[model samples]
Target: ARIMKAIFVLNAAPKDNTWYAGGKLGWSQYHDTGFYGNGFQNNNGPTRNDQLGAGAFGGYQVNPYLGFEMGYDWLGRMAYKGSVDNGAFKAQGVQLTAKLGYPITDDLDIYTRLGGMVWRADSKGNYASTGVSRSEHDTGVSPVFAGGVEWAVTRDIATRLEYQWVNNIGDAGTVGTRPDNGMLSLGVSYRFGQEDAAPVVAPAPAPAPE
Candidate 1:
């Protein structure tokens, strides 16, 4: 018989802006292109699309090693203070994934996941040049990849931490090919239906040979 387990995961995902951070030399532009950008340090710059987000996941495990999961995330809001306008964008999405995991210890397991994510976002604000306010909504599907570790806190409970990415998030727009929207998250899970592994004992020898 196959052992089946169910788990729920809660997490947080942030805005990824690494795409823009790789361009421009020392803000040489007469304009502050870096205003809505991301980078490493001073000359390395900082992320302007920085956002803190929250999400959750739920899945069914077929065994101690494999499972399937689906979940949603609210990726927070990004406020853009630009030469043209000051605006904010909000993103959220649903994802389904196949997870492959292996036990590193009795209470620990490491995993990698692959999936497709469908997302929707809305943006609204006003132009800095004119008092024009505009709102737009977008939806798209992208490939998402992730890896993480899960530690069983006890029977029926576990804790996990992971990093994930959804590709081409803000592409096909003004920002075009921006960072793959994603984040690092920590979560806890409640598992049930699957029992712990047990051992079998052999019968004692028949009464010491009569």
Candidate 2:
């Protein structure tokens, strides 16, 4: 019975815990007008809301379905449209997240992440009327959410497409109204220390020449 149980366990697929690291490049967009002022009217909003975004992350998979991650993201910048008092807002942040995964097949998986991000933003304001320019720095924490699908090309290499959102990334007093940000990214990751499957055991030989 013990030998039978051992063989059964070996026949089951192995779920090895491993560590992984990845990087992503994407497009990011701000969800609202980034600034407000008496001189800034309805039409005087952001001229360009989309920019290049990039991030890197690393995590330990506790099992096939659960993991934890730490990451840093550059969420990109926003440019306002106005001849006077025009400036830009840019942001970056770090996050701690709990990753939940669901495997659809041997090589395909879908995942979601819930996390908190500590974000820092810099805003540049140029006041043409007063002939003065100013830059303000602000920092805050916000909730972040992400979902993605991953395809494993090899045991150690995988590719993913993901979308992430950060809520209220700046301070109203420093960078005007806070804006929600979203990023859609393509990423690649490499897993480390993948254990080989257990070797098959030969059947025990019957007693010889009994």
Kindly give the stretch of ten consecutive residues in candidate 1 with the minimal lDDT sum: 20-29
- Candidate 2 lDDT by residue in tens digits, 1-210: 345553346524465576778877876444454555587456447566467777887777776657998878764545457756633755567888877766686778777666667867656555443433344566767766576777889767888877754232321233221344234689898867556877565576665787
Residue 197, candidate 2: how far off, in angstroms?
20
For residues 19-131, what per-residue lDDT tens digits would candidate 1 score against the true structure? Answer: 10000011100223356456633554565735455556666665554577675665454555556753375556777877666667577877666666687755655533243
- Those runs of model 2 whose alpha carbons end farther than 4 Å from true positions after fitting are 1-16, 32-50, 63-65, 75-92, 121-134, 164-182, 194-210
- Tell me the RMSD of model 1 versus the true structure: 16.4
lDDT of 2 at 25: 80
Best by lDDT: 2
Instruction: Pull out the clashing pairs in model 2.
Output: none
Question: What is the lDDT, from 0 to 100, of the residue 77 in candidate 1?
Answer: 44
163, model 2: CA deviation in Å? 2.8
